[PDB]
């Protein structure tokens, strides 16, 4: 029973990492867009 529970937990943990990585990537791109907007605005 512990083996089944840990296997389910590991699968849920791996799914959460994929979801978090998907969300982190969106936050990574939005950070770049913000910087490329302030610097371009600051240039002009």
């Amino acid at each position: 029973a512990r083996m089944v529970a840990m296997r389910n937990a590991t699968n849920n943990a791996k799914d959460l990492v994929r979801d978090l990585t998907l969300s982190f990537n969106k936050a990574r791109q939005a950070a770049i867009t913000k910087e490329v907007s302030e610097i371009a605005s600051g240039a002009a």
Partner: protein, 493 residues
């Protein structure tokens, strides 16, 4: 005063010094010169003092400094009329199929205010897409703005093409606007429309990826102007005047990308996700023109089917949420369902049509309400599907029935189903008449049933089609006739 000279050609924008008495969206001409036999047009937008910025509707390497420009005296307009039917044209209205010059008696200016609020009526006339899931769970009415949002290769273009194909005898003027699509895909779409004979009533406006960012930005407005002309004036289709039109904008995400490129090349300030702050205004003024006018303004309609491509099924992006807020409903095409084999992949749990539920044939809704309820029960029981032999008879039966209904919803491509066939199949499915049929063979069972009704019982189909408008569809006559038909089919099978 009608003539001016270019003084700078840059990031797809010319400066056109000295062209006064030009209106704020006039289409300038750039008359042909040596090396350029044809004329490429431009949209004058920034009518500042002693300079007229003009977006070059085409490749910007063709013109130089010192080129002569002549103002055509017209706000940017696309030729429109009955001659456009069955033709593939540029956003400017010029033909690209090579069949011949476009014949037209009047031109309708793109970029116009939508008719308004009072000039509208609630949608009542349904639109038959031909997909069981869409026509049973997400009803579409004439004049409704239904969004087809998915994740890349999921079937949004396929769904739009099926909807266009099904409008053969429905008195609709389909319009397919390809924005940013590669030429191979547009060619395949046009060929598919030609093969099934739907190209006789379909106008295709193509602004492909290689085309300039000035195009892919006016293409949806050109298509919408064509649809507006169909909606207000109307055209003769199959010897009858039709004032109802359907327009598919295809990838509006690529349209937003093209407008972003145009704005950034004009040095306009960026907004969220580097899109210009008026991208919502862009898509809203594009989609608001798709209306269902009331009788006193002609009674016409214009159904819109914008297509939005998401990344990693991120429905909470900027452009997808903008279009969702603009439109009346959504058709979420999940990638997981598409990969799992459910080719008409629909996230029925979250796909919805706010308007058009009352704009449905009474037979379809009367047979599909319990369909939607049973699908909801199956989705609720999806969590318990993992357990084996731990479920009672009721839950097991519900799971089996939900699987059967999902397999029935699985419909092969390029095969629209008439409304009578759809309602008959759903009536068969929802009356415990398919519980004995194994799940993997339900598709071929449906195909055989449709073939049997086409060959053996045309009178049942005709009676259902004539009695689909009644308030109480399950009248004893149609009920007994269709029950006898299904009993005969089951006995023969």
């Amino acid at each position: 005063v009608n003539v001016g000279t270019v003084i700078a050609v840059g990031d797809g924008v010319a400066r056109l010094s000295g062209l006064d008495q030009v209106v704020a969206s006039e289409i300038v001409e750039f008359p042909p010169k040596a090396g350029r036999n044809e004329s490429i047009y431009g949209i004058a937008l920034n009518l500042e003092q002693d300079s007229v910025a003009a977006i070059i509707l085409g490749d910007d390497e063709t013109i130089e400094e010192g080129d002569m420009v002549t103002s055509t005296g017209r706000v940017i307009s696309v030729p429109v009329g009955q001659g456009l039917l069955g033709r593939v044209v540029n956003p400017l209205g010029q033909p690209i199929d090579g069949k011949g010059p476009i014949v037209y008696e009047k031109t309708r200016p793109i970029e116009r205010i939508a008719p308004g609020v009072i000039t509208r009526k609630s949608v009542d006339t349904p639109v038959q897409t031909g997909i069981i899931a869409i026509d049973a769970l997400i009803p579409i009415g004439r004049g409704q703005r239904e969004l087809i949002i998915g994740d890349r290769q999921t079937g949004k273009t396929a769904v739009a093409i099926d909807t266009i194909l099904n409008q053969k005898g429905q008195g609709m003027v389909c319009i397919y606007v390809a924005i940013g699509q590669r030429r191979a895909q547009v060619a395949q779409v046009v060929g598919t429309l030609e093969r099934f004979g739907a190209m006789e009533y379909t106008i295709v406006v193509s602004a492909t990826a290689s085309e300039s960012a000035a195009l892919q930005y006016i293409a949806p407005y050109a298509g919408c102007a064509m649809g507006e002309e169909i909606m207000e004036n109307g055209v003769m289709l199959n010897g009858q005047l039709v004032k109802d039109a359907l327009i598919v904008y295809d990838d509006l995400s690529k349209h937003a990308v093209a407008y972003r490129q145009v704005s950034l090349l004009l040095r306009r300030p960026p907004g969220r996700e580097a899109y210009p702050g008026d991208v919502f205004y862009l898509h809203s003024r594009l989609l608001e023109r798709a209306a269902r006018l009331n009788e006193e303004y002609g009674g016409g309609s214009l159904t819109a089917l914008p297509v939005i491509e998401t990344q990693a099924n991120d429905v909470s992006a900027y452009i997808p949420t903008n279009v969702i807020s603009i439109t009346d409903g959504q058709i979420y095409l999940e990638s997981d369902l598409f990969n799992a084999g459910q080719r008409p992949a629909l996230n029925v749990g979250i796909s919805v049509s706010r308007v058009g539920g009352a704009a449905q044939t009474r037979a379809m809704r009367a047979v599909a309400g319990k369909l939607k309820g049973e699908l909801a029960q199956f989705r609720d029981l999806a969590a318990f599907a993992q357990f084996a032999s731990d479920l009672d008879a009721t839950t097991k039966a519900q799971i089996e029935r939900g699987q059967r209904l999902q397999e029935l919803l699985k419909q092969p491509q390029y095969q629209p189903l008439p409304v009578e066939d759809q309602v008959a199949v759903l009536y068969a499915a929802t009356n415990n008449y398919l519980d004995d049929v194994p799940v993997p063979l339900i598709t071929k069972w449906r195909d055989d049933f449709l073939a049997f009704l086409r060959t053996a019982h045309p009178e049942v189909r005709k009676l259902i089609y004539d009695n689909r408008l009644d308030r109480k569809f399950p009248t004893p006559e149609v009920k007994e006739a269709l029950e006898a038909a299904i009993k005969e089919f089951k006995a023969t099978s």
